[PDB]
Amino acid sequence: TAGKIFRAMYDYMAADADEVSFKDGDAIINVQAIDEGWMYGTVQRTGRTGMLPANYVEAI
């Protein structure tokens, strides 16, 4: 029942207040998903919500 969840694999560095800073090993959820472009979830490491590069995080 809605248990896809995701996971990051790199230490992305937010460029502004629109992205997030998740590191490899941290987990995240999925409030949105533009696909073929960027993503959106709440950093479980702190709770900030922003965009994420699909070329960094992946599913598990």
DSSP 7: E
Asked whether 54 and 6 are in contact (CB, 8 A), the reply is: no
User: Interior CA angle at 46 toward 26 and 18, to 5°?
Assistant: 95
Structural domains of the chain, ranges and CATH numbers in brackets: 1-60 (2.30.30.40)
CA pair distance 51, 49, nearest whole angstrom: 7
CA pair distance 28, 38, nearest whole angstrom: 14
Q: Structure solved using which method?
A: NMR
CA pair distance 34, 13, nearest whole angstrom: 20
